[PDB]
């Protein structure tokens, strides 16, 4: 099953960070990182007061549960410093999953209200369908969310 995962940063230089992140995503077992997005700048969605973040999203094989994939980007996320954000990992998307559990809300709740998801995400995944039938490149368009910056 493909899970696309998001990663953010907003340490001042977050590039330790995000390229550590996906070589510890590379790492997860009975998993295959299929591709990476470039790497964007992103001025913060809610409080402004922040530094920008490094936002791209990752294209993930893996035959692993959902939730013993979330357990293993939160363990990444331990040991890079997470308990500005140093790091956050979303899972964005499982397969055609819907999951609604405590641990777990796939799709992400949240990301199609996000610029900083969805374009790094239609780099990778052009013609991404969602569980409820919308093409990505529809919700683009439709929020007209602006282009984003290369790191
Ligand atoms: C600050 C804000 C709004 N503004 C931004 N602006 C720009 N420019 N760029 C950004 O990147 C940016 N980032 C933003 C942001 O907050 N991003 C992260 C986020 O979405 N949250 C907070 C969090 O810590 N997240 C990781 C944890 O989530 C858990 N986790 C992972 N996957 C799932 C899932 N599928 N279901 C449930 N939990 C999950 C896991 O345990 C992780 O540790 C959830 P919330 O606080 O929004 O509810
Ligand atoms: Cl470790």
Redesign the pocket.
Known sequence: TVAY??????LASPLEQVNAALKALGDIPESHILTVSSFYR??????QD?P????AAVALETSLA?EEL?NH??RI?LQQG?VP?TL?????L?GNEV?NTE?????????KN????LWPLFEIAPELVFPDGEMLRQILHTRAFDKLNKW
């Open positions: 995962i998001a990663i953010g940063s907003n992103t001025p913060p969605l809610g409080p922040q920008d973040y490094l936002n959902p979330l980007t939160q996320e997470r954000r956050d990992l979303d899972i964005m499982f999951i641990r777990l809300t796939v799709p992400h709740y949240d990301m996000r610029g900083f998801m």
